[PDB]
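testing teh design pipeline on a random one, pls ignore if ur not involved
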C-alpha cells in the first residue's frame, strides 16, 4: 500500500516519469516523501506549492510559517523536511533556482542533490514552468544527480511527450 506508484515509464534504474498532477499522485500513492517546488520563505502562493498547500487545507502554510519564524529562510539549492500532512509521511521542500528572477541555473544540481537523503520520492520537475529553466535540461540534471528512487509527476501531456522523446533519442 505504501509507495504504490502506477503507470510510470522507467527512464533509468532509479528515475520514473508520468503525466500526472503531483497532488493526485500523492492521494493515490501515499508516498513516504512528496517533494514541493518551494521558494526560500516557503510562501506557497501558486503553481505546484499552492496546489500541494490547498490539498492540505492550508495546514502546510501554517507549519511553514512557524518553521521560517524559528529557522529563517532557506537558501536557493537548499531544503527542509516538514510534515506531509494528508499527502505523504514527509514533505521535502526544495528550492530550485528561479532563472526568470536571475538565480543561477548551476544551483539546480544542488537542488536535486537534496533528494539523495530519501530512499523513495514523488517529485515535480524542479525549476520548470514559471521558474524558467529548460525542462529538458532539468530532467537531464535529475537523471545525472539523483541516485535514490525518484518518481516524477509532470502535469502536462505535451511536455511529458517532449521529455520522453528527448531522453530516448
Ligand atoms: C511544468 C509544469 C507542468 C509543472 N506543473 C505541475 N507539475 C506537477 N503537478 C502539478 N500540480 C499542479 C501543477 C503541477 C511545474 C513543475 C515545476 C514547477 C512548476 N510547474 S511552477 O510553474 O509551479 C514553478 C515551480 C516549479
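output:
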Amino acid at each position: 500500500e505504501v509507495n504504490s506508484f502506477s503507470g510510470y515509464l522507467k527512464l533509468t534504474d532509479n528515475v520514473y516519469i508520468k503525466n500526472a498532477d503531483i497532488v493526485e499522485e500523492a492521494k493515490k500513492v501515499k508516498p513516504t516523501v512528496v517533494v514541493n517546488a518551494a521558494n526560500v520563505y516557503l510562501k506557497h502562493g501558486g503553481g505546484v506549492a499552492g496546489a500541494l498547500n490547498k490539498a492540505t487545507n492550508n495546514a502546510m502554510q501554517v507549519e511553514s510559517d512557524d518553521y521560517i519564524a524559528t529557522n529563517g529562510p532557506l537558501k536557493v539549492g537548499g531544503s527542509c523536511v516538514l510534515s506531509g500532512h494528508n499527502l505523504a509521511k514527509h514533505c521535502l521542500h526544495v528550492v530550485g533556482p528561479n532563472v526568470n528572477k536571475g538565480e543561477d541555473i548551476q544551483l539546480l544540481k544542488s537542488a536535486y542533490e537534496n533528494f539523495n537523503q530519501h530512499e523513495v520520492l514523488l517529485a515535480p520537475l524542479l525549476s520548470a514552468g514559471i521558474f524558467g529553466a529548460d525542462p529538458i535540461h532539468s530532467l537531464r540534471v535529475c537523471v545525472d544527480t539523483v541516485r535514490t528512487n525518484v518518481y516524477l509527476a509532470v502535469f502536462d501531456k505535451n511536455l511529458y511527450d517532449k521529455l520522453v522523446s528527448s531522453f530516448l533519442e
